Amino acid sequence: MQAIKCVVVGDGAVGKTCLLISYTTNAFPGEYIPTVFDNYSANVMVDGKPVNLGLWDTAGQEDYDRLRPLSYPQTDVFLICFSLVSPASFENVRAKWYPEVRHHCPNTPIILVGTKLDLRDDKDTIEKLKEKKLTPITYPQGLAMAKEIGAVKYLECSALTQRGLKTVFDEAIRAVL
Amino acid sequence: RKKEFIMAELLQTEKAYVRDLHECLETYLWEMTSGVEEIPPGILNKEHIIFGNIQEIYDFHNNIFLKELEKYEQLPEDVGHCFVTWADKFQMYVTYCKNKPDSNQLILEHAGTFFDEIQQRHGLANSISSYLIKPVQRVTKYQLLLKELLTCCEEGKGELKDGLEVMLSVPKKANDAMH
Ligand SMILES: CNS(=O)(=O)c1ccc(CNC(=O)Nc2cc(C)on2)s1
């Protein structure tokens, strides 16, 4: 049965750990957001074909440019993530994440994931951004970034509501099959 | 309440880290050192390259660090001191990180499916590679737990700051040690 290593990369603002927890437990953790998600694997069926999906977090390695690539070899698919309500994380897809992932893994598929979809329409989040002369990241912006990096898909999700969340990981697997 | 959830996670994840290294040592490593199975010439007598100093990391955690963290369970605001006390031991993650690329290529280029065979045989969810990244994960995670404690512990909290300092310095020094 096919084994799949999927690594999750991107800025601290994406909520990488919360994403993975919410996905694997089928619930936003709410009460307390754990800082630790340990390497995970489970059987999921996608388009019939059953598969063993492996998930690695990288939270905590955001400042260690030489330690991060220790996780990259033999990855089957990357999720490169940014938060929809952090333009700085979005720009880092291009400045930081894509270059290193490509440098180490030139032929590995990338899914581009915008997280915190639940905040893109949130008045307080919007106003906090307007006070810095910024706005949330919209759909065509993600599509244009996906195209620029060679991403096979651009997908938007919320760990909070689960909207789009299961699809992210379905599509990660489809990108390998 | 928040400081208690973080401390609990600290301890629970320390226990899992100890269990994880212990499993790695007694399956993947024990098959190489045992004398029970067919060892590829490509890796023979190179368990030192593959596993680096992971024995010694495990012994630190299993003999010392976990017992001490446990003593700070009801003292979350003081736990930074644990990292100060034991700062010298964390220097071994610098050695471990340095070696890790040599480890990975060695397993790639020369081990074929020796370790996959072992994994299937023991019924392990985690591959040898999954286990061997763990020290790199753990050593960069302590600083996140200390930052969380800083967001919810009072000015009785240079007993977090100095701990965090140490736990920022170790991974940076490991990072700066890579070629
Ligand atoms: C912007 N950060 S915040 O102001 O601290 C805040 C965090 C969480 C908040 C509630 N919404 C989410 O977590 N939605 C997520 C998390 C992931 C991954 O994808 N969607 S509001």
CSV table of N, CA and C in Angstrom, one decimal, chain A residues 5 17 32-41 52 56-68 70-71 73-74, chain B residues 5-6 9 13 97 100-101 104 108 125-126 129-130 133-134 136-137 140-141 143-145 148 168 171-172 174-176 178:
chain,number,residue,atom,x,y,z
A,5,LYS,N,4.9,10.7,2.1
A,5,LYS,CA,5.5,11.7,3.0
A,5,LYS,C,5.0,13.1,2.5
A,17,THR,N,0.6,24.0,12.9
A,17,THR,CA,0.3,23.0,13.9
A,17,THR,C,-1.1,22.8,14.1
A,32,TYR,N,-7.2,24.9,23.8
A,32,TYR,CA,-5.8,25.1,23.9
A,32,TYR,C,-5.2,24.7,22.6
A,33,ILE,N,-4.4,25.6,21.9
A,33,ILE,CA,-3.8,25.2,20.7
A,33,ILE,C,-2.4,24.5,21.0
A,34,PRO,N,-2.3,23.2,20.9
A,34,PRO,CA,-1.0,22.5,21.2
A,34,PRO,C,0.1,23.0,20.3
A,35,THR,N,1.3,23.1,20.9
A,35,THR,CA,2.4,23.5,20.0
A,35,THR,C,3.0,22.3,19.3
A,36,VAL,N,2.7,21.1,19.7
A,36,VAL,CA,3.4,20.0,19.2
A,36,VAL,C,2.4,19.1,18.4
A,37,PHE,N,2.8,18.8,17.2
A,37,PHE,CA,2.2,17.8,16.4
A,37,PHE,C,3.4,16.9,15.9
A,38,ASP,N,3.4,15.6,16.4
A,38,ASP,CA,4.4,14.7,16.1
A,38,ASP,C,4.0,14.0,14.8
A,39,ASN,N,5.1,13.5,14.1
A,39,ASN,CA,5.0,12.9,12.8
A,39,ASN,C,3.9,11.8,12.8
A,40,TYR,N,3.1,11.9,11.8
A,40,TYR,CA,1.8,11.2,11.9
A,40,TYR,C,1.6,10.3,10.6
A,41,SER,N,1.0,9.2,10.8
A,41,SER,CA,0.5,8.5,9.6
A,41,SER,C,-0.8,7.9,9.7
A,52,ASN,N,-1.4,5.5,2.5
A,52,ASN,CA,-0.8,5.8,3.8
A,52,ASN,C,-0.2,7.2,3.8
A,56,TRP,N,4.3,15.6,8.4
A,56,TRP,CA,5.3,16.2,9.2
A,56,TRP,C,5.1,17.7,9.3
A,57,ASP,N,5.0,18.2,10.6
A,57,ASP,CA,5.1,19.6,10.9
A,57,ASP,C,6.5,20.1,10.9
A,58,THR,N,6.6,21.4,10.8
A,58,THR,CA,7.9,22.1,10.9
A,58,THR,C,7.9,23.3,11.8
A,59,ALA,N,6.8,23.5,12.6
A,59,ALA,CA,6.8,24.6,13.5
A,59,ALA,C,8.0,24.6,14.4
A,60,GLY,N,8.5,25.8,14.7
A,60,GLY,CA,9.7,25.9,15.5
A,60,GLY,C,11.0,26.0,14.7
A,61,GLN,N,10.9,25.6,13.4
A,61,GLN,CA,12.2,25.7,12.6
A,61,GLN,C,12.2,26.9,11.7
A,62,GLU,N,11.3,27.9,11.9
A,62,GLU,CA,11.2,29.0,11.1
A,62,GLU,C,12.4,29.9,11.1
A,63,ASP,N,13.2,29.9,12.1
A,63,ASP,CA,14.4,30.7,12.0
A,63,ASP,C,15.7,29.9,11.8
A,64,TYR,N,15.6,28.6,11.5
A,64,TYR,CA,16.9,27.8,11.4
A,64,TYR,C,16.9,27.4,9.9
A,65,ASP,N,17.5,28.2,9.1
A,65,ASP,CA,17.5,28.0,7.7
A,65,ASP,C,18.2,26.7,7.2
A,66,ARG,N,19.3,26.3,7.9
A,66,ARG,CA,19.9,25.0,7.7
A,66,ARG,C,19.4,23.7,8.3
A,67,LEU,N,18.6,23.9,9.4
A,67,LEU,CA,17.9,22.7,10.0
A,67,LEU,C,16.7,22.4,9.2
A,68,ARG,N,16.0,23.4,8.7
A,68,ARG,CA,14.7,23.1,7.9
A,68,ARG,C,14.8,22.1,6.8
A,70,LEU,N,16.7,19.6,6.6
A,70,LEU,CA,16.8,18.2,7.1
A,70,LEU,C,15.6,17.4,6.9
A,71,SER,N,14.4,18.0,7.0
A,71,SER,CA,13.2,17.3,6.7
A,71,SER,C,12.8,17.2,5.2
A,73,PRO,N,14.4,15.9,2.2
A,73,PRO,CA,14.6,14.8,1.3
A,73,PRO,C,13.6,13.7,1.4
A,74,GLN,N,13.3,13.1,0.2
A,74,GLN,CA,12.3,12.1,0.0
A,74,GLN,C,10.8,12.4,0.3
B,5,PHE,N,-1.8,24.0,30.9
B,5,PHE,CA,-1.9,23.2,29.7
B,5,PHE,C,-0.6,23.2,29.0
B,6,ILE,N,0.2,24.3,29.0
B,6,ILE,CA,1.5,24.2,28.3
B,6,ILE,C,2.5,23.3,29.1
B,9,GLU,N,1.7,19.7,28.3
B,9,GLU,CA,2.1,19.3,27.0
B,9,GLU,C,3.6,19.1,27.0
B,13,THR,N,4.7,15.5,25.9
B,13,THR,CA,5.5,15.4,24.7
B,13,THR,C,7.0,14.9,25.0
B,97,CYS,N,22.8,17.3,14.7
B,97,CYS,CA,22.3,18.0,13.5
B,97,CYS,C,23.4,18.0,12.4
B,100,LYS,N,23.4,14.7,10.5
B,100,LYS,CA,22.2,14.2,10.0
B,100,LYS,C,22.1,14.1,8.5
B,101,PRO,N,22.7,15.0,7.7
B,101,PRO,CA,22.8,14.9,6.3
B,101,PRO,C,23.6,13.6,5.8
B,104,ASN,N,21.5,10.7,6.3
B,104,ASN,CA,20.4,10.5,5.4
B,104,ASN,C,20.9,9.9,4.0
B,108,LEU,N,20.1,6.4,2.2
B,108,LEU,CA,19.7,6.5,0.8
B,108,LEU,C,20.5,5.6,-0.1
B,125,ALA,N,4.5,2.4,12.5
B,125,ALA,CA,4.0,3.6,11.8
B,125,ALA,C,5.2,4.5,11.3
B,126,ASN,N,6.2,4.7,12.1
B,126,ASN,CA,7.3,5.6,11.7
B,126,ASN,C,8.5,4.9,11.2
B,129,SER,N,13.7,7.2,9.0
B,129,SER,CA,13.8,8.6,8.8
B,129,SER,C,12.9,9.5,9.7
B,130,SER,N,11.7,9.1,9.9
B,130,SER,CA,10.8,9.7,10.8
B,130,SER,C,11.3,9.8,12.2
B,133,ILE,N,14.5,12.3,12.3
B,133,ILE,CA,14.3,13.8,12.4
B,133,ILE,C,13.9,14.3,13.7
B,134,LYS,N,13.4,13.4,14.6
B,134,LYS,CA,12.8,13.8,15.8
B,134,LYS,C,13.7,14.6,16.8
B,136,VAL,N,15.8,16.7,15.8
B,136,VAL,CA,15.8,18.0,15.2
B,136,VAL,C,14.5,18.8,15.5
B,137,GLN,N,13.4,18.0,15.5
B,137,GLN,CA,12.1,18.6,15.8
B,137,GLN,C,12.1,19.1,17.3
B,140,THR,N,13.9,22.2,18.6
B,140,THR,CA,13.4,23.5,18.1
B,140,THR,C,12.0,23.8,18.7
B,141,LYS,N,11.5,22.8,19.4
B,141,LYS,CA,10.2,22.9,20.0
B,141,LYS,C,10.2,23.5,21.4
B,143,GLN,N,11.8,26.0,22.7
B,143,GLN,CA,11.7,27.4,22.6
B,143,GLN,C,10.2,27.9,22.3
B,144,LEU,N,9.4,27.1,21.6
B,144,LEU,CA,8.0,27.5,21.4
B,144,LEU,C,7.1,27.3,22.6
B,145,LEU,N,7.4,26.2,23.4
B,145,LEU,CA,6.8,26.0,24.7
B,145,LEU,C,7.2,27.1,25.7
B,148,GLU,N,5.3,30.3,24.7
B,148,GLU,CA,3.9,30.2,25.2
B,148,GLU,C,3.8,30.5,26.7
B,168,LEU,N,17.1,29.1,22.5
B,168,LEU,CA,17.2,29.7,21.2
B,168,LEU,C,18.7,29.6,20.7
B,171,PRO,N,19.6,25.6,19.2
B,171,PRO,CA,19.2,25.4,17.8
B,171,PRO,C,20.0,26.3,16.8
B,172,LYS,N,20.2,27.6,17.2
B,172,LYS,CA,21.0,28.5,16.3
B,172,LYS,C,22.4,28.0,16.1
B,174,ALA,N,23.3,24.8,16.5
B,174,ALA,CA,23.2,23.6,15.6
B,174,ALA,C,23.0,24.1,14.2
B,175,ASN,N,22.2,25.1,13.9
B,175,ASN,CA,21.9,25.6,12.6
B,175,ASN,C,23.3,26.1,12.0
B,176,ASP,N,24.0,26.9,12.8
B,176,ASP,CA,25.2,27.6,12.3
B,176,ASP,C,26.3,26.6,12.2
B,178,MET,N,26.0,23.7,10.5
B,178,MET,CA,25.8,22.9,9.3
B,178,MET,C,26.6,23.4,8.1
